[PDB]
Amino acid sequence: HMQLSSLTAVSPVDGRYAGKTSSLRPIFSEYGLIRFRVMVEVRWLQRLAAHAGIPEVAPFSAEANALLDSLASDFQLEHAERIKEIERTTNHDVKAVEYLLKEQAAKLPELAAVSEFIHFACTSEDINNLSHALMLREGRDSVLLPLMRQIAEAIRELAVKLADVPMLSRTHGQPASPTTLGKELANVVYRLERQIKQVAGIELLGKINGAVGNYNAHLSAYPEVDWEANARQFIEGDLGLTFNPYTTQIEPHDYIAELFDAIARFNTILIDFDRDVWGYISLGYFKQKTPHKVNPIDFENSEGNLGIANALFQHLASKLPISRWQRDLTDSTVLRNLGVGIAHSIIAYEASLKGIGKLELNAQRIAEDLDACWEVLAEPVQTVMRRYGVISAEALQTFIEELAIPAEAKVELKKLTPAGYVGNAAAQAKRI
Amino acid sequence: HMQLSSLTAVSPVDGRYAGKTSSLRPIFSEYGLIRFRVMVEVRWLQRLAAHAGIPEVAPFSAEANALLDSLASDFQLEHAERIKEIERTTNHDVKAVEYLLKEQAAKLPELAAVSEFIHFACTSEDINNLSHALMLREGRDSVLLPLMRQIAEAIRELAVKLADVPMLSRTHGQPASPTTLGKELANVVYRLERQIKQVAGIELLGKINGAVGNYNAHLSAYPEVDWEANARQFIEGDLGLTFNPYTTQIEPHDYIAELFDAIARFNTILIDFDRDVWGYISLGYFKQKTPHKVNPIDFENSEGNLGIANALFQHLASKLPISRWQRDLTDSTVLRNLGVGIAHSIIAYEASLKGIGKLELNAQRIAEDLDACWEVLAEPVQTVMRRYGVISAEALQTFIEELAIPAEAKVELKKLTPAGYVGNAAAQAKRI
Amino acid sequence: HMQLSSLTAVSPVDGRYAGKTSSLRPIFSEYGLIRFRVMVEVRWLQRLAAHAGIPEVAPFSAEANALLDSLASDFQLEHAERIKEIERTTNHDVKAVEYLLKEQAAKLPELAAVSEFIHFACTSEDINNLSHALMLREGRDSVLLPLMRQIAEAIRELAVKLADVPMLSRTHGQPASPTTLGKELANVVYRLERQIKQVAGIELLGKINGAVGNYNAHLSAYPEVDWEANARQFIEGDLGLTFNPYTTQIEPHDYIAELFDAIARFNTILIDFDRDVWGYISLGYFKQKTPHKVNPIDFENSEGNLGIANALFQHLASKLPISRWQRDLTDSTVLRNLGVGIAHSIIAYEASLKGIGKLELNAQRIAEDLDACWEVLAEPVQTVMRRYGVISAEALQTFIEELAIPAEAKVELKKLTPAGYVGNAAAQAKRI
Amino acid sequence: HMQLSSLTAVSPVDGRYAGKTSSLRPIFSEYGLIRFRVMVEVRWLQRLAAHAGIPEVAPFSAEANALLDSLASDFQLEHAERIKEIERTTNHDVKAVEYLLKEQAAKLPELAAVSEFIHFACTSEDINNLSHALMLREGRDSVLLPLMRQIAEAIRELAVKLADVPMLSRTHGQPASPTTLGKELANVVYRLERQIKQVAGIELLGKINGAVGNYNAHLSAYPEVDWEANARQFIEGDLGLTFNPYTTQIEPHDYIAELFDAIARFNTILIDFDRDVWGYISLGYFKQKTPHKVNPIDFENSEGNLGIANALFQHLASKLPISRWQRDLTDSTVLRNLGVGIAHSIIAYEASLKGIGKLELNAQRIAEDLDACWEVLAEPVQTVMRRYGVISAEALQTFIEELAIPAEAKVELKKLTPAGYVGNAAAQAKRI
């Protein structure tokens, strides 16, 4: 038997790439799950204390709220370790959270007096689903989106820098009408930013409604309380999530599919970018900074990890929203992997950022391919001939002068070179 | 060699289920692709005719517009057959569309005079991408969304009808706090309608910008025309699509991934429904209308086709937005399958609708399971005991009377039966 | 409503590519399913006639066997059309096959006398599973494997032809130790032929054992007959398939997953080849026969169709072998698509063959890249230095002469050029 | 920042399920990769020492082989830690292995004398591909296959125990001809054992041929050595793997797809079993040992993990065998996940074994459903009537006596009960 460390970890998420994924440890690990379960339970008790229709839980003093707030906003590793020890006796992970809170409540008579209202009328999935939404919110807002925007801005900076650099296009791998290198990078920024907006806009849904979605227990004890209004206030007001009014025992997980589908679309664009840049490197269009070749390993590591991320995202999106009758428990183990596709994504984003920072233009190779391709000028000549109802630089001057076009058109056509035939690529690139 | 018919078709889309998919023949077949290519080319010529900066194409008479409008809005099978014959000579499908329009333009001297402006400055993908967006728009709006809404409304009608029918819940397959059958159906309506809104809201993106995205040819012939403003007017104003300002030779297909991801999420909810209903049938909770068992074949046929649809949607979403450099042509053959996942979806939707229409409540079996499960009343008794700081119908009356709870609580608790312990399921179901 | 033809077909299997998939119409269409159902039923009746333990069915005369053999080995479209008409009354597809055979048996008093033994003791899935295995056998052996072997042999011919052509290798897109173009093609042949052997070796499993796998009905009527021995004789001896002794109502479909996984592996190698050849074309290493560029469209069409084929193969392999309890009917509709992944595969194989036939070496471009890369000779110099314990052609001659290596080694090292540094690539390529 | 432990690990492979996956730490972690790289390098040096055509490396003394054998067969964590420290200076993981071996060789003048032949003529992928094959071999043979066989034998034991227990079948969820519970379990054993044989039979392929597959460096230094024969001897003879004679820089990874496809097929059968058992539990056919319901959580945890395993297996099988030209490096990061699908598989296998061990027959519920379904006897009555050319127990006795069948048939038919109508299910189950 070998002790666990990054050297011995089976998955490279916590192994080879442990340093790239460490920002997810407070969020998606069992520690993070425990952290958010504690937060939800604490806030639920505070909600009952604030609710005048639940007189059995009175408003808390500053002293009692200080203790509760410390558990919900300054959670310590020792609390999670204690919950793991408690779970040895409860054989149930959410019940262990309840008992930790009961142990903490025993420190103050004011909290001990209402210890039986911890988890009041709740089912385990009331705590779990809100925890998952809060985990996804923190992962999305504090880790994933910042890296996504860093990629977009890094590519934008290069697109503007290279906006005026003419470059031969390749369609089906072969010469095509010219563009600029900055324009080809700007195209990627625009696609990535569409998906960033979609990722940021996904509603993160939560519920709190008891065993099967119908507030049965709540209404047996407190028939006069509007539990649906309380649930919406708790979820939207206290927790800052979006309310899901119709559920079974579980929140149905459609929004997780929505979020993972959006991240996967961002990742697909980044795969396309990683492969195109690998190709530009193979052509010698980029070189090493400070010609020394640039090794494309960072783009390749990114590409490999994005494919794994997307395979996990696709599976979770396809499988999570199917649950037998009022639920089966297959989702419990699967939801322990909410951070794994995110981990492979952020490994890839860091790698793509590292690769982008190594890129320096090799203008000589770019110009070499463009000047060797005067065939790209057949298209503008044909289009000008077509307007007026009608290869080498030397041949172009004699051909154009013999055309039945206005002399002003011949003057501009005769000045045409492959590097000049870029349309409005540069203006489009500059304003990305 | 065997002649093609629905009996000999290799794919069941045009074979066994030809009658279920016939509404897609005007849209996603090669006929539909040709139809929309013709429409785009006609509208492009009309756009140039309306554009004062393109004086070489003057506004058309009513007579000339009548001919053009007939091709763009009353397209005939004979025109598509002629395009297929022309393609034998052009060896190029978009070029065959151009030649058909040139043949039609030859009928009127006014149109013949501008025949060289058909396809002016366009690349094949300018026509193809707009065609694909228009195909997806018609398929989504006229075929897919109506069926999706029919499913939601059919389930809503049953949910309201059955809103008051108490039913034992099953979590991990085993008895749980009761609900109503109508509530369990209402949950599905709510999920489906979220995805319907997402499907309807996807932007269908188009571009028209020449060979590589930079208007190179347009600007060589007409340097003074604002071609980007013209493209947005054509796409948003004339065609009613959403403009994509940054592309390569192809429109990058991210929006197709967005649309297919949304349809797939709807389909996942419907798989979940098909399987749950199969389970309710297995329990005998539904019977045949007009007890005669109901055969669940329609739900099973739906479930099978939804899985195929989603596999195709996932592949197209994952693969289409990756294209080498300024494009490779792998997307051309793949985009001929835009209607195939939609076809399997609508086969499944029709089957689910047929199955829903066969369902009739078997109240005896539902009540039998509920009355045989007094264990579900432990939860409300525990919760009431918990509020006040504290199985059979006969045992419940003696147990409750011995509790230290207010007599008003004992009166309500003693009246508890499994069929009565439904929380607010009925009110939630009725307002779906 | 539009009449069905290849122009109006929704799926390109029977649409744009109808001419490429027509060889599957006798096999995987509803016609093919019907054809094989008839074959199985006829052979089953003949098996009972030959079985001395079933005296109620006596051996058939030559006249009666002539009629039966015509249905089982010279099946006509009119019989399938009649079965479709009969199905309008039976509302059951296998029952319609039974009634067609009863109608044919009515033509001869000898067959009419035993018409009630058509389908004797069978369940629908006894007929269906054997039909599916026979469909897969004919599709694999008569269509798929011949095309797979054609690809392997076409690449082999080019590998041997080009075995001596030195070529710069590219690892991570950048120059690496040289190989020969023929060697790089030979590598593909070897991989493809491994998968061909695996495809050909899959056992195609069948069963015939009544409603749930236990011969219940057979044993009630004929308790003294060894029905398991009869089933193995029918399946292995009469039909030439492999016997599956343990099933439920359905044959469990694991072997279909085995077969589809093997075809998918062949297809993955072919995708890799299609993309590598697209790359060699982009480098100008191949040109058009009879330099004129070769358009790589055939490789791109192949690549696109292989991805679709593999997505369908993966879904059917993953979903078919899961069936609720003694079976659910979701497999029935899915198995109508057995030929669809095969269809996309053979579309791709034909396209790859067409592309291979267009390839002609462009020796000038290949030699140009090799001579411009003397850096590849650092590896052999280092290795020779390492053996004995120790860039340009002019610099290499002076560097080698100063080394403390045997003079015989310096003579061979000084003769080193990039095009000569190919190891044993040519000998490996020639013997593929 | 949080220190890594099982509590803080992002992936549940090394987190919640660390205790279930610990047997993979010596194999698939970075430690395991390093361990096998060291083994391959040591054995390669020993191969050169044994090769008379490489006189520069003489046979090793017992003392020198003792040191080398200790590194290759008694590898210590401290060696892997040292390699990680060395990698800080080399910036290259395989080069760090080379330097560790050079440091160890410095301990003995005999080994120091040939330190420059460590890694002689090798490329990094020569070491990596053999390491991967050896990792897969140990994972398959020492961890995966033993658990797979444990599942098969555990189900076999229950199948034989329950071989005589009659049970109503359910097809499309509804009553069907009876079977025995042991027969339904035996069906699973047979399917699982077919896949076990396939998993065990996959060839694990290796190569050792330098930078691009052509032995370029080897032949420059030792033109007279048969390096292909040496490679086959090393791989098949010294390492016990299967030789792959045609590769590029990488071994192409087809065999990894073969292995992962086979494991995935086993896993699909186990998903089917997990779901069927969940269903039998929901029906009350199994209860808790020592009626107390059995909670199906172990089957649900298994089912969830099998789906994740298969998604990873499918992705690696589909992506690994595609590598640009003579290779791209996307496979390097992906191959760090070789153990992750295996980890989710063994988590699921342990869970399924735990669930199987909790199952105890509830004969009362099984008999209750069977006796309430006399409709299953229509099939045997119809079949007997059909042989001779022709519901309740009381109605069956009067109906059978009125039939024109031999009196011996009526005596056996009149004795028919649903629980007796099991065909040969029991004999098939007993011999599994």
Classify residue D417 as exposed, middle or buried by CB count within 10 Å of its CB (0-12, 13-18, 19+): middle
Other CB atoms closer than 10 Å to residue A88's CB: what's the count?
8
* CA–CA separation, A214 and B425 (whole Å): 5
Catalytically annotated residues of C: 172
Cβ separation of B10 and C343 shorter than 8 Å? Answer: yes
The answer for residues whose C-beta is within 8 angstroms of residue D207's C-beta and 6 or more apart is D126, D129, D130, D213, D231, D235, D243, D244, D245, D247, D251
Other CB atoms closer than 10 Å to residue C251's CB: what's the count?
25
State whether residue B340 sits within 8 Å of chain C by CB: yes
Name the active-site residue from D1, D172, D253, D344.
D172
Q: Which of B184, B182, D275, B368 is nearest to A326 (CA)?
A: B184
DSSP readout, A38-66? HHHHHHHHHHHHH-TT-TTSPPPPHHHHH
* CA–CA separation, C332 and C334 (whole Å): 5
The answer for residues whose C-beta is within 8 angstroms of residue A62's C-beta and 6 or more apart is none
* CA–CA separation, B293 and D144 (whole Å): 45
Q: Which of B343, B280, B362, B388 is nearest to B135 (CA)?
A: B343
State whether residue A389 sits within 8 Å of chain B by CB: yes
* CA–CA separation, C38 and C70 (whole Å): 11
The residues with which A170 forms a beta bridge, in sequence order, are A175
Are A314 and A256 in contact, with CB atoms under 8 Å apart? no
Other CB atoms closer than 10 Å to residue B106's CB: what's the count?
11
- Dihedral sign of CA atoms A359, A362, A368, A370 in order: positive
Of the candidates B172, B279, B297, which has its C-beta nearest D296's C-beta?
A: B172
State whether residue D249 sits within 8 Å of chain C by CB: yes
Q: Which of A373, A413, A404, A256 is nearest to A322 (CA)?
A: A256
Q: Residue ranges of the domains in chain C?
A: 1-118, 119-373+423-432, 374-422
Q: Tell me which amino acid residue B256 is.
A: I
| Partners of residue C300 in chain A, C-beta under 8 Å | 172
Cβ separation of D276 and C325 shorter than 8 Å? Answer: yes
Report the interhelical angle of B93-105 vs B124-138 (nearest 10°).
Answer: 90
Q: Which of C105, C122, C123, C124 is nearest to C114 (CA)?
A: C105
* CA–CA separation, D150 and D192 (whole Å): 11
Helix (H) or strand (E) holding A174: strand A174-180
* Overall residue count recorded for chain D in this entry: 432
Other CB atoms closer than 10 Å to residue D279's CB: what's the count?
20
Other CB atoms closer than 10 Å to residue A240's CB: what's the count?
12
Q: Tell me which amino acid residue C237 is.
A: G
* CA–CA separation, A193 and D415 (whole Å): 75
State the smallest CA–CA distance between residue B341 and chain C in angstroms.
10
Task: Give, in order, the Cα–Cα distances in Å from C378 to each of B247, C261, C375, C399, C401.
Answer: 43, 43, 6, 11, 15
Coil, helix or strand at residue D245: coil
Cβ separation of D331 and A80 shorter than 8 Å? Answer: no
Are B210 and A177 in contact, with CB atoms under 8 Å apart? yes
Structure tokens at A195: 């998906």
Subunits next to C (3 or more Cβ pairs <8 Å) are: A, B, D
Q: Tell me which amino acid residue D267 is.
A: N
Tracing tokens 């598989």 back to the chain, one arrives at: D345
According to DSSP, residue C11 is labeled: S
Are B129 and B252 in contact, with CB atoms under 8 Å apart? no
* CA–CA separation, B329 and B319 (whole Å): 12
* CA–CA separation, C235 and A93 (whole Å): 54
D window 319-338, beta carbon within 8 A of A: 319, 324, 328-334, 336-337
Q: Which of D179, D201, D207, D97 is nearest to D376 (CA)?
A: D179
State whether residue D195 sits within 8 Å of chain C by CB: yes
Range list of H helices, C113-212 = 124-138, 145-161, 181-201
Active site residue D1: no
Structure's resolution in angstroms: 1.5
Residue A424's region, left for phi above 0, alpha for psi from -120 to 50, else beta, is alpha
What is the C-alpha end-to-end distance of chain B, expressed in Å? 55
A131 φ, ψ to 5°?
Answer: -60, -45
* CA–CA separation, C210 and C125 (whole Å): 8
How many Cα atoms within 13 Å fall on the side-chain side of residue D349?
A: 26
Cβ separation of D173 and B295 shorter than 8 Å? Answer: no
* CA–CA separation, D427 and D179 (whole Å): 11
Range list of H helices, C283-296 = none
CB pairs under 8 A between A and C: 32
Other CB atoms closer than 10 Å to residue B72's CB: what's the count?
19
Q: Which of B128, B129, B94 is nearest to B254 (CA)?
A: B129
Structure tokens at B311: 């596999």
State whether residue A296 sits within 8 Å of chain C by CB: yes
Q: Which of A363, A349, A27, A374 is nearest to A182 (CA)?
A: A363
* CA–CA separation, D253 and D336 (whole Å): 14
Coil, helix or strand at residue C1: coil
Cβ separation of D278 and B174 shorter than 8 Å? Answer: no
- Dihedral sign of CA atoms A317, A322, A327, A328 in order: negative
CB burial readout A167-187, b (16+ within 10 A) else e:
bbbbbbbbbbbbbbbbbbbbb
Are C426 and C182 in contact, with CB atoms under 8 Å apart? yes
According to DSSP, residue C206 is labeled: E
* CA–CA separation, C401 and D130 (whole Å): 37
* CA–CA separation, B313 and B339 (whole Å): 10
Coil, helix or strand at residue C423: coil
Are C421 and C376 in contact, with CB atoms under 8 Å apart? yes
Coil, helix or strand at residue C321: coil
- Listed as own residue / partner, the contacts of D29-32 with beta carbons closer than 8 Å and 24 or more positions apart are D29/A7, D29/A8, D29/A9, D29/A10, D29/A15, D29/D339, D30/A6, D30/A7, D30/A8, D30/A9, D30/A12, D30/A15, D30/A16, D30/D80, D30/D84, D30/D336, D31/A2, D31/A7, D31/A8, D31/D77, D31/D80, D32/D135, D32/D339
State whether residue C84 sits within 8 Å of chain B by CB: yes
Residue A172's region, left for phi above 0, alpha for psi from -120 to 50, else beta, is left
For residue B90, say whether it is annotated as part of any ligand binding site. Answer: no
For residue D93, say whether it is annotated as part of any ligand binding site. Answer: yes
State whether residue B300 sits within 8 Å of chain D by CB: yes
Are C376 and C418 in contact, with CB atoms under 8 Å apart? yes
* CA–CA separation, C105 and C64 (whole Å): 9
For residue A295, say whether it is annotated as part of any ligand binding site. Answer: yes
E strands within A263-364?
Answer: 286-288, 359-361
The experimental method is X-ray
Coil, helix or strand at residue A170: strand
| Partners of residue B176 in chain A, C-beta under 8 Å | 211-212, 249, 326
Cβ separation of B252 and A191 shorter than 8 Å? Answer: yes
What is the C-alpha end-to-end distance of chain A, expressed in Å? 55
Structure tokens at A130: 């809100």
* CA–CA separation, B84 and B76 (whole Å): 13
* CA–CA separation, C146 and A251 (whole Å): 52
Give the 3-state secondary structure of chain B.
CCCCCCCCCCCCCCCCCHHHHHHHCCCCCHHHHHHHHHHHHHHHHHHHHHCCCCCCCCCCCHHHHHHHHHHHHCCCHHHHHHHHHHHHHHCCHHHHHHHHHHHHHCCCHHHHCCHHHCCCCCCHHHHHHHHHHHHHHHHHHHHHHHHHHHHHHHHHHHHHHCCCCEEEEEECCEEEEEEEHHHHHHHHHHHHHHHHHHHHHCCCEECCCCCCCCCHHHHHHCCCCCHHHHHHHHHHHHCCCEECCCCCCCCCCHHHHHHHHHHHHHHHHHHHHHHHHHHHHHCCCEEECCCCCCCCHHHHHHHHHHHHHHHHHHHHHHHCCCCCCCCCCHHHHHHCCHHHHHHHHHHHHHHHHHHHCCEEECHHHHHHHHHCCHHHHHHHHHHHHHHCCCCCHHHHHHHHHCCCCCHHHHHHHHCCCHHHCCCCHHHHHHCC
